[PDB]
Amino acid sequence: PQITLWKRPLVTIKIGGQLKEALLDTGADDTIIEEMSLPGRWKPKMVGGIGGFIKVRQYDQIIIEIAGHKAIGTVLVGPTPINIIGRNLLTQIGATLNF
Amino acid sequence: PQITLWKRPLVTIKIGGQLKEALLDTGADDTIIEEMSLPGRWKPKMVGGIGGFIKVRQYDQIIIEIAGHKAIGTVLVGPTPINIIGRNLLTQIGATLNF
Ligand SMILES: CC(C)(C)NC(=O)[C@@H]1C[C@@H]2CCCC[C@@H]2CN1C[C@@H](O)[C@H](Cc1ccccc1)NC(=O)[C@H](CC(N)=O)NC(=O)c1ccc2ccccc2n1
Ligand SMILES: CC(C)(C)NC(=O)[C@@H]1C[C@@H]2CCCC[C@@H]2CN1C[C@@H](O)[C@H](Cc1ccccc1)NC(=O)[C@H](CC(N)=O)NC(=O)c1ccc2ccccc2n1
Numbered sequence A, B: 001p002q003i004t005l006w007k008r009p010l011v012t013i014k015i016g017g018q019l020k021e022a023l024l025d026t027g028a029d030d031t032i033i034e035e036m037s038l039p040g041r042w043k044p045k046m047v048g049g050i051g052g053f054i055k056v057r058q059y060d061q062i063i064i065e066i067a068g069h070k071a072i073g074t075v076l077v078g079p080t081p082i083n084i085i086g087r088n089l090l091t092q093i094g095a096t097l098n099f
Helices: A087-093
Strands: A010-015 A018-024 A042-049 A052-066 A069-077 A096-098 B010-015 B018-024 B043-049 B052-066 B069-077 B096-098
Touching: A042 A069, A052 A087, A069 A087
Parallel strands: none
Antiparallel strands: A010 A018, A010 A052, A042 A052, A052 A069, A096 B096, B010 B018, B010 B052, B043 B052, B052 B069
């Protein structure tokens, strides 16, 4: 699709076998999902946002299906206000900014 | 331009004689730039993101060139680690997210 930015670019994702929504975020280097369980071992990390750094669990090689397109990569879990899909996964769906 | 996301989508911006860089940020409602203090009246306000909230000064009707395109709108000024071009000015420059 071609998504205009009149409103927040939310799409349906599927992760851990569950449907959720998430924000497609060209400004985010990483993908971060609201607290949930995921398989495999995780490592503790910190990541910084506009208001300071948060603690998160980093999971590797996680499958997300983003608006019907498959992506696999690192997914952080931590206290985010909203699930965000950042550039590490947006590149695998060929997403681009056009103007 | 059709911009892929293998790296951060930074562009040159010009606000009032000052040449700066900023991140085209689909995941941001607002435009936030670390600046001296633009001309005109402002009002204080708190904006947030991952990690909590920062204090900004809100300026309306700011004229800023973004990647060679003219936009006029609200610009928030305060202590952001990275300057960001949010959706309120992305729509003015005709930016869309595509995949
Ligand atoms: C709406 C309300 C009754 C307050 N319920 C909740 O907020 C529950 C409470 C639960 C316990 C606390 C931890 C989170 C869970 C899940 N949340 C809902 C959570 O799963 C759901 C995710 C979502 C967002 C947008 C579109 C679809 C789905 N978020 C929400 O319902 C709330 C309300 C809203 N205005 O959208 N959204 C947000 O809180 C939120 C905050 C910042 C954002 C920035 C950009 C884009 C979206 C943003 N959404
Ligand atoms: C997600 C993460 C990997 C942590 N990356 C980032 O957070 C980087 C950090 C960078 C350096 C500091 C300044 C921002 C840049 C770009 N961001 C991405 C950037 O896209 C970030 C993603 C985001 C969206 C919604 C909620 C929280 C976080 N957006 C933002 O920080 C924008 C800023 C703004 N316009 O006010 N926030 C929001 O648009 C927004 C909207 C509603 C909200 C409700 C409750 C709490 C926070 C809310 N934030």
